[PDB]
Design a binder for this molecule. Structure first.
Ligand SMILES: CC(C)CN(C[C@@H](O)[C@H](Cc1ccccc1)NC(=O)O[C@H]1CO[C@H]2OCC[C@H]21)S(=O)(=O)c1ccc2c(c1)C(=O)O[B-]2(O)O
Ligand SMILES: [Cl-]
Ligand SMILES: [Cl-]
Ligand SMILES: [Cl-]
Ligand code: NA
Lengths: 99, 99
């Protein structure tokens, strides 16, 4: 689709069989999701947001559908204010910014 | 232009007579710029995300040139680690997300 920006670009994602709402976020390098259960091992990551740095859990090679598009990649789990789809997965779905 | 998302979508802006580099950020409702002086009245606001909140000064009716396109709107000024062009100005330059 072509998504204008008068409203927040919220989409439905599917991860671990569950539907969640998430924000398409070109200002995020990484995809960050609220606390949930994911399979496999995780590794630590420090990410720096508007308010400072936080620790999150990094899960790699996670299957995730974004607005109906299949992606497989890194998902960070931690205390984010909203689920954000960052550029690591926006690139997988072929998203560009245009003006 | 069409901007791919392999790297941060950084553009040059002009604000208050100064050139700065800023992120085109679909995940931000509003535009947030590092500390600088702007003309006119302002009021304080708290904005929050990953890592918590920061206090900013809200200036209304500020003109920015974003990658050569002029737009006017509210600009928040404070200790953000990155300059952020949010939806309030992305709409004005006709920016869309496409996939
Ligand atoms: C969290 C999101 C819903 C909202 N933000 C935009 C988001 O795009 C940030 C933009 C940003 C980019 C670099 C550094 C700091 C901030 N990205 C981000 O945190 O990305 C993380 C995930 O990947 C990592 O890569 C980049 C950092 C890491 S915000 O900045 O917190 C933000 C922007 C505007 C407003 C508010 C909060 C608010 O409350 O009112 B407001 O005036 O509307
Ligand atoms: Cl840890
Ligand atoms: Cl990835
Ligand atoms: Cl505005
Ligand atoms: Na003003």
């Amino acid at each position: 689709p072509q998504i204008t920006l008068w409203k927040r670009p919220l989409v439905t994602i599917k991860i671990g069989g569950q539907l969640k709402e998430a924000l398409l976020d070109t200002g995020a390098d990484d995809t960050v999701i609220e606390e949930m259960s994911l399979p496999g091992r995780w590794k630590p990551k420090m990410i720096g947001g508007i308010g400072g740095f936080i620790k999150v859990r990094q899960y790699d090679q996670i299957i995730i559908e974004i607005a109906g598009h299949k992606a497989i990649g890194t998902v960070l789990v931690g205390p984010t204010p909203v689920n954000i789809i960052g550029r690591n997965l926006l690139t997988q779905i072929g998203a560009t910014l245009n003006f």
